[PDB]
Design a protein around this ligand. Structure first.
Ligand SMILES: [Hg+2]
Ligand SMILES: [Hg+2]
Lengths: 368, 370
């Protein structure tokens, strides 16, 4: 039995292609469910059979059980526990959950930081433990599982929580928070502060950096004196999302339909500048407009008296993206270029359109 | 980001699956065209683009530069030039041309034969060259390139080439032709007498050491890879032998037949008719077994007898029209031919094998080899 040296790029093409295939299949299947010709069904079923089996084989080439990374943790946790004179009940779940070989080497250290973090500022000393009337032995859980097109990983504990007020008063000092906008902030955007470089040595920002370079996402959930639950979501296979194709200076960009609110057709008189940015008011609501070409360091090419503004949506605050044209909707395959786009504020990645072409994905959050 | 070592067992599934996808695409398109469907043209065009792109990257992976086999030739040619007391100007081109890994191991020996052949009986001794007014030093070119889903390897001469009249003369003595009559067939047609086993030397395939390999054997190897061989020569000008090798999958329609519970495939291209028959219809004349169809006495062979342990698959090879007896037919099927090399090379009965939808191996029968 032999093996062959295969370039990592080739395995990436296979991945993209498979994702493309998933979409092609699905579409041809949907555009002809009405016809009820037995000969046709049997051909469709064959296509799907081969398509599904093809995806399987690519997965086998790329997948690996998360055991690889998980296995070394109990001992490390056992030892981190000794140094900090505190006993902990460590529990791992779904160690057999499979993920991309690429992830094993990289997710290892970020996961350790979360476990260590839990053992320091999570689980409290036996003194506090008893004062709050919580069990003497603390609980630390590392979970792994599949959900949709994501390899989900969570680290849970019954520590001291986070105390959101600690973050508010601490954030009011340096930059961002004023004070009256803090009392109007969502509960997740305070736990999100935890990622800003100036807070809380390694931090917590560096962990999210890694998970993002892998095209994954990180989340925090905590309750004062109850515990903390940090979630990491990793792509299982490539991500397929519906997007709005937009044209600017003849180039095509994609805006995730998920973030889109409604599309306007604003004019020049319709714009009014207030200090640093331009804005439009819609039903008494102030929405800051941004010309995509100004954001991408590009040039003007005939200012159309009637412009089109894709009004986007961030958690609680919304904006507007003025573009040249609106090509239409499209199901697209997001490429594994995490390392590449994680450094760019303007884009969140590159996608593969049905066309067969590549379009950058406008990163709405990075344009505020 | 370097590389990753993948099991060939998985990479082989990709080869088989990609075959099925192509076939699965044509199947669906055909059935669509039958019942007349039109709205599915864009999504279908995408599928085909993807299908095509998948095939390429899947092939590309197994590929490697021909420079793997080419690089060892200069020294070998320099050495073969020494033994024959003759200097040669050897030139290689397109060493960077890629082809399937399978071919590297197999194409090596066949190409050495052509090089040696050229250096030996092709380029004349220096005295002769100055007498014919050709540059004293002989030239030999070994080149490769891509010419539309094929790797074209060429070995070219400056030598004496070969005289068509000298071969016709021998083709006369032993069977092949008339004193002149049939000889009026195109120059290319008359060069293939070099691909006949009995030509040039003696026959044992094991007997290479002490006599030679034989031009016919080179053709067989390149064909077992599903390639094609061609020759071109001009008296006292030179010789150019071309070898073509497929860059993609070869899909042919074949008749699946069963013998002793094993499945064999007979290329539909040959079969002219299929009819059910019984033991009593097989009349044994000389040593041969035959059947009578509308009064035509037709030669017949029991497949389990040709190999080693009823339906009559009448085929047509050139002039020959004979039948192949089997236990039962398992209908038609589009199959993908797989590369092996020195495997089915010596076996005349087979021209290779194909993989079936269910994952079972199906030996493809060589009609002309019976
Ligand atoms: Hg869509
Ligand atoms: Hg067929």
């Amino acid at each position: 039995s032999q093996t062959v040296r295969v370039d990592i790029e080739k395995l990436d093409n296979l991945m993209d292609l498979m994702g493309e295939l998933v979409i092609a299949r699905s579409r041809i299947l949907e555009t002809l469910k009405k016809y009820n010709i037995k000969e046709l069904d049997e051909s469709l079923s064959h296509l799907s059979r081969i398509t599904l089996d093809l995806q399987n084989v690519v997965m086998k080439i790329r997948m690996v059980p998360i055991s690889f990374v998980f296995n070394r943790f109990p001992r490390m946790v056992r030892d981190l526990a000794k140094k900090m004179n505190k006993e902990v009940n460590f529990i791992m779940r779904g160690e057999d959950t499979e993920l991309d070989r690429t992830f094993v080497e990289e997710i290892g250290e970020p996961l350790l930081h979360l476990l260590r973090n839990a053992i320091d500022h999570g689980i409290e000393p036996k003194e506090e433990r008893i004062a709050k009337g919580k069990p003497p032995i603390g609980t630390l859980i590392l979970s792994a599982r599949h959900e949709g097109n994501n390899v989900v990983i969570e680290v849970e504990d019954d520590g001291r929580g986070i105390d959101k007020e600690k973050i508010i008063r601490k954030a009011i000092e340096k930059g961002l928070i004023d004070e009256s906008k803090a009392a109007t902030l969502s509960d997740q955007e305070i736990l999100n502060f935890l990622f800003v470089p100036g807070f809380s040595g390694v931090g917590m920002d560096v962990v999210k950096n890694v998970v993002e370079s892998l095209n994954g996402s990180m989340g925090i959930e905590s309750e004062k004196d109850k515990g903390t639950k940090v979630t990491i979501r990793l792509p299982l296979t490539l991500a397929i999302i519906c997007a709005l194709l937009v044209k600017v200076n003849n180039l095509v960009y994609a805006i995730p339909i998920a973030n889109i609110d409604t599309i306007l057709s604003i004019s020049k008189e319709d714009i009014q500048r207030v200090q640093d940015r331009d804005v439009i008011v819609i039903r008494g609501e102030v929405i800051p407009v941004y010309r995509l070409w100004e954001v991408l360091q590009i040039e003007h090419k005939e200012e159309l008296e009637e412009m089109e503004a894709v009004i986007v949506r961030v958690g609680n605050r919304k904006y507007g993206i003025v573009v040249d044209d609106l090509l239409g909707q499209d199901d697209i395959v997001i490429k594994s270029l995490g390392k590449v786009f994680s450094e760019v504020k303007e884009f969140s990645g590159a996608a593969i359109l049905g066309d067969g072409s590549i379009a950058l994905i406008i990163n709405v959050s990075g344009i505020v």
